[PDB]
């Protein structure tokens, strides 16, 4: 899908990309440090090669554009790129 090349675009791995959790701008922007100008949608995929969640912020529906990707390891750790 779009939302699968954009993870594999940005990580180089085809991962199982789940539904997707709505998040409000304040909720977003305490997680990011940024704060989106609307609904975020999260779509989170697990990296198993890594142990790692992959998670891709985008716009609500119907432009699911993609805002930024956050990568957590085992350890609790985000990795954030803004797209």
């Known amino acids: 899908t ?3 090349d954009i993870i594999e675009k940005e990580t180089g791995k085809q ?3 789940q539904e997707s959790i709505l998040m409000l ?3 977003v922007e305490e997680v990011i440090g940024n704060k ?3 609904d975020i949608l999260v779509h989170t995929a697990y990296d ?3 142990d ?3 998670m891709l912020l985008t716009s609500d529906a119907p432009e699911y554009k993609p805002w930024a990707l956050v990568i957590q390891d085992s350890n609790g750790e985000n990795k954030i790129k803004m797209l």
Do not use: F, Q
Request: glycine share 0%; net charge negative.
């Open 2 to 4: 779009n939302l699968s």
């Open 15 to 17: 991962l199982v990309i």
């Open 25 to 27: 701008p304040e909720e």
């Open 36 to 38: 989106p100008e609307s």
């Open 48 to 50: 198993e090669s890594t």
């Open 52 to 54: 790692e969640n992959v």
